[PDB]
Amino acid sequence: SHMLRPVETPTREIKKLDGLWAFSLDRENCGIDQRWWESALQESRAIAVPGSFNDQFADADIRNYAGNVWYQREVFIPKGWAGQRIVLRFDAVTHYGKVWVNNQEVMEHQGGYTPFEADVTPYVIAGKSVRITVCVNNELNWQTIPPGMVITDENGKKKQSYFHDFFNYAGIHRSVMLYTTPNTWVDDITVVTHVAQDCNHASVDWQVVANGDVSVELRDADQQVVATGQGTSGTLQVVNPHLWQPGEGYLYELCVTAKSQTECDIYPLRVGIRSVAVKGEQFLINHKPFYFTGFGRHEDADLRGKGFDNVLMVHDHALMDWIGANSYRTSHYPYAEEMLDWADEHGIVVIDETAAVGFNLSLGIGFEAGNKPKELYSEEAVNGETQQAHLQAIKELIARDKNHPSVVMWSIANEPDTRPQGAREYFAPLAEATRKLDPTRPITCVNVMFCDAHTDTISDLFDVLCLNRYYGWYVQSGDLETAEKVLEKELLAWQEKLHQPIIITEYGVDTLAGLHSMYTDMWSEEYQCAWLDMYHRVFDRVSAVVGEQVWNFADFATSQGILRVGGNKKGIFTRDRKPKSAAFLLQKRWTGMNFGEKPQQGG
Amino acid sequence: SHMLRPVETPTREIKKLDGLWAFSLDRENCGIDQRWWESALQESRAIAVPGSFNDQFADADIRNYAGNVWYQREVFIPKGWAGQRIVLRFDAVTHYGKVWVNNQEVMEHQGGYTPFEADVTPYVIAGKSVRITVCVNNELNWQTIPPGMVITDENGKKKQSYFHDFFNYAGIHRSVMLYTTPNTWVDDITVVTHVAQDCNHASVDWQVVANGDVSVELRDADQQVVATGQGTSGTLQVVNPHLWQPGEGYLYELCVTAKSQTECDIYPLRVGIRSVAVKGEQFLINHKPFYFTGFGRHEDADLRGKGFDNVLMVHDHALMDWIGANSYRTSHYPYAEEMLDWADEHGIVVIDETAAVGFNLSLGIGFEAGNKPKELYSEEAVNGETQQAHLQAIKELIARDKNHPSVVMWSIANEPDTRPQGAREYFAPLAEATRKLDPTRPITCVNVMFCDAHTDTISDLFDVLCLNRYYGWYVQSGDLETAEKVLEKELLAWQEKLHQPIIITEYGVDTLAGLHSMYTDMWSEEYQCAWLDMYHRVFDRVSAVVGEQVWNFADFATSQGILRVGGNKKGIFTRDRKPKSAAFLLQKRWTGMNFGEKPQQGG
Numbered sequence A, B: 001s002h003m004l005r006p007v008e009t010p011t012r013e014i015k016k017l018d019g020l021w022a023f024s025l026d027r028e029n030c031g032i033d034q035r036w037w038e039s040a041l042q043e044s045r046a047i048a049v050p051g052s053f054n055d056q057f058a059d060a061d062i063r064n065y066a067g068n069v070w071y072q073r074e075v076f077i078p079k080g081w082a083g084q085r086i087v088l089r090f091d092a093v094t095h096y097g098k099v100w101v102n103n104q105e106v107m108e109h110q111g112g113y114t115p116f117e118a119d120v121t122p123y124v125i126a127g128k129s130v131r132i133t134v135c136v137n138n139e140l141n142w143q144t145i146p147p148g149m150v151i152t153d154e155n156g157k158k159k160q161s162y163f164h165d166f167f168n169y170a171g172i173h174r175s176v177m178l179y180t181t182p183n184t185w186v187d188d189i190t191v192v193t194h195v196a197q198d199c200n201h202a203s204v205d206w207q208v209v210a211n212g213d214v215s216v217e218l219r220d221a222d223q224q225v226v227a228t229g230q231g232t233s234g235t236l237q238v239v240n241p242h243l244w245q246p247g248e249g250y251l252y253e254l255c256v257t258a259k260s261q262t263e264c265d266i267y268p269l270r271v272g273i274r275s276v277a278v279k280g281e282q283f284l285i286n287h288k289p290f291y292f293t294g295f296g297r298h299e300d301a302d303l304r305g306k307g308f309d310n311v312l313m314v315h316d317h318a319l320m321d322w323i324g325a326n327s328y329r330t331s332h333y334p335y336a337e338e339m340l341d342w343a344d345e346h347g348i349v350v351i352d353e354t355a356a357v358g359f360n361l362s363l364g365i366g367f368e369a370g371n372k373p374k375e376l377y378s379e380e381a382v383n384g385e386t387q388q389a390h391l392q393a394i395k396e397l398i399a400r401d402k403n404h405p406s407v408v409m410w411s412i413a414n415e416p417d418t419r420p421q422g423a424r425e426y427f428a429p430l431a432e433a434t435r436k437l438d439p440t441r442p443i444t445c446v447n448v449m450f451c452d453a454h455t456d457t458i459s460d461l462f463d464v465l466c467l468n469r470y471y472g473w474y475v476q477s478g479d480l481e482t483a484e485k486v487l488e489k490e491l492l493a494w495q496e497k498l499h500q501p502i503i504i505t506e507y508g509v510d511t512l513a514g515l516h517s518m519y520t521d522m523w524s525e526e527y528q529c530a531w532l533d534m535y536h537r538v539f540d541r542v543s544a545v546v547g548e549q550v551w552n553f554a555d556f557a558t559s560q561g562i563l564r565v566g567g568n569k570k571g572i573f574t575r576d577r578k579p580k581s582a583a584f585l586l587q588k589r590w591t592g593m594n595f596g597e598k599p600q601q602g603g
């Protein structure tokens, strides 16, 4: 369906993020049968929203729980909301939600990183209290967007396994809200900026609408009406403009009016005049040779999970700004939109990514019981549904982020195994369909190191080359000397194979803060520094390398294992954001360069 | 004025603690000259509210700033608020804050820890958008609670100095909000709960109204009307009751209605039926001797400073519940009211404390010779004005917290130097005023160890003896054998001197997580364990000891010096809430006792 980011004019919100809700586990899965949502959850306790449920209670049994949990809370609908449109919206519900307003089932959602909403006017009465009950599921299976497998034990209980690193946080991770609309209402919008050698340029509106006529007006930074359009379906305004750029990120505001003889609906959609596409081995934003810096990130932090948080947000960006990141990627799931609004506002370049992670079964590291399906693409394991579920996941992200100028690229998935058979048959359609959803931006699929330049059957189908590489770490462990060869050899081997522009979307080594070594070896701070030094030395000797993003901005939490010391320790910063000695090395390189500019194959 | 906590009944909030606001320093002190409230702030970066401002940007220069800062933000008055009393309320602005609505100054408050609100209807238009500038100031002086001394070097660069441990974090630490009432509205309520060997009793009630007749009903847990009342400023209700009790804190709800001829107002006040009194050396709750366990805590966490936060609150409360703590003291300043609602609901016992720490010029770190007034109680230093600003701090605190059944006593100050004559001159009238302000709870003043049983001049004026003791650590360093003899001799001296109940409100040692030692000496986890254990042996020998609150729940940021290794490490938990091994020691001692009940002098 249609997603529009709420803002506040002929519409206003009660955020329900007001944190404390009633909470409970349903270890018997008797909750739907016993119709829990008709009265107050019993045996509950306070929980905060937004945040993951897992770590709020310091309890392993809750942390590793799998199945359904219940959220409940009450809330007076504002008196002024008349006969108006009342709309309940969740920015995310991690993995799956079902919603009961008093007794009315109003909503259902699968996907954990994108919004869903419903018109609730008929079971609500403005000026009165209404119960809100949410049922939340955190289970993953094969047609799910990260896939996974729930093993039920003989003894009654579930237990989740899956194929990615990062830990399976679940819950209401983002803002909920009740919001208000006129019965005339904008409900969809799309916008495209074309650029021309940097002198002048044009933007297209298209806009689905609740019944009404659209006056479309584009405003200055200073609110001077410099673009006007008529029509409820389409326009193009060719004004000679001020562009969205990386150092600075200028933005226009396109108000959107939908009219009836009774009503009016007014919408400001921030807009960045920017063009994105690839030319040969170059990446082009406003027809310029960019160079990417920054990291893969996660939504992870002590206590809250992947739960959204303003302070955290403000601090991390301060940190990225300081250290010279111009860009980052939404590692392995759609992030809360606020990050993107900030990126636009601040001109930060974003490779936007779907939750399609862990399609891979070789990854890995198993001393344990094998199964585990034999064929990756099978009706058993990655199947028809799964391509369809996956398709739907790509719609939504694009539905949400097409209008965010900061997004210069889409990412279809991260590290799928492309050595098994259906791997090109699975990936070709979605690659086509992606561009049929948005042809304004290039599209990639992020590449695991064992589908290497001679074995990977999928890369031509995409526009840019996104590599995750560990050459001294998982292989050649500890050996910078031979690691540098393999890496360059393999970067050159990609350059000729595909003659595409190359970005390393993951390069990094586990490092324990405070571990220091005169022998400069694995897990030491010094080693991280030497290893990043080297990867760097090597992108300076390759023309096709136009992007660099460090494995992890900060240490995050993982599934429990032998290869993870209390989590992934590959952060430049610790989880509480204290900088490892490598923050200061990246500091120099990233602020020493010219903005958006590769070195002189040296410096 | 009158302070009631906003809730949603006829009443309605729009949170606006939506926390993205604009922000900047004022280094040359131009802000009030150039009427900054009049135009949108310039050179202004995004900051999260609520939060301390110091830590969100990873910048030492902002962190250590002294002077004025500005928060600015536009908002929408709900169209629905038509005939409405519209109030702008700030839960806290740390130290002083001045507020403009669009070139209309509406407020000013001095105090960093309690709310201030203004009726703003005539400066706002329902359904339009407003600009709100706050000027916040973080400086301390001899008349501020707490006190301090700004030092300006030869260059005019201000530098704050103060006499307490914890870091002077400042900013808007708690929510801001626009909220609604009718022009007939309850603006103050007061409840006193009485009880007699526990079978049934009454609640006196006093109710101040904005223009109306008042009526009153006591609704049950399951919402049934257990009693009724009429009259305005006076009533009393009798009941066969489930008392509010340390374990569980059962709550009735008192329902206040102010009626005009035209307009109507409704206010729910949670009521816990319980009595609190000292009887000799015992502290009685519902007529039963109670024994406190638990912490002095702070408002502190990474990134957000003293900024309030829901996930953090739910997590620390799971921790204290797990560990067996039945109480705490709002060390050092009034805490977020949310903290007290939680206490109310879960039956946590609280010692509520003003921000009056630092009265002492004798807790210096060493050897920066200068230079501080030589007479503590003098016109230069702690003078008639200070005593006024102190009395004010007491009033504001009690006005806020008087109906919180979780509050069982008021602490007026922490570790004042009571040796200098005039200490008694300064505190006697404060002791007196406080009792008059609330006659329903015991009163205390927390005692610093070098004011000892033979030198202290103030403790006879208060009801309960609360001692901060550090034998083995600041004095007799490392020597448990002799620390233990001195602790016991001193506690016995106090018992015989005053025959009051003794709560040790601070005892703890700095412990670096992960420093382990076979010698069981000073900064190791093993010492923290052995030291608390020695303290425990002595408490169980002394019959007037009626409570124990370990000094720190968690490590916290302090100002820099040679005694604080990046903060106070007397934490039981680290700042990121990881348990030190003393956590399991306390857990065993506190969950092993009978709930609320002093041990039998034995294991």
Ligand SMILES: COc1cccc(NC(=S)N(CCO)Cc2cc3cc(C)c(C)cc3[nH]c2=O)c1
Pocket: A162, A163, A164, A165, A362, A363, A364, A365, A449, A450, A468, A474, A475, A506, A559, A561, A563, A564
């Ligand atoms: C199931 O969730 C988990 C749990 C714990 C660890 C991981 N590891 C992950 S995601 N990575 C991918 C790094 O981008 C490390 C990894 C690299 C790797 C490289 C090669 C060349 C081979 C042959 C096998 C490999 N196996 C691996 O595990 C995943």
Ligand SMILES: COc1cccc(NC(=S)N(CCO)Cc2cc3cc(C)c(C)cc3[nH]c2=O)c1
Pocket: B163, B164, B165, B166, B362, B363, B364, B365, B415, B448, B449, B450, B468, B474, B475, B558, B559, B560, B561, B563, B564
């Ligand atoms: C960062 O804020 C700062 C800065 C500088 C110093 C401190 N120190 C603090 S708060 N204390 C805590 C006292 O509860 C240690 C202390 C103990 C003490 C004991 C005796 C028996 C005597 C005679 C003198 C003493 N003086 C002290 O200072 C804190």
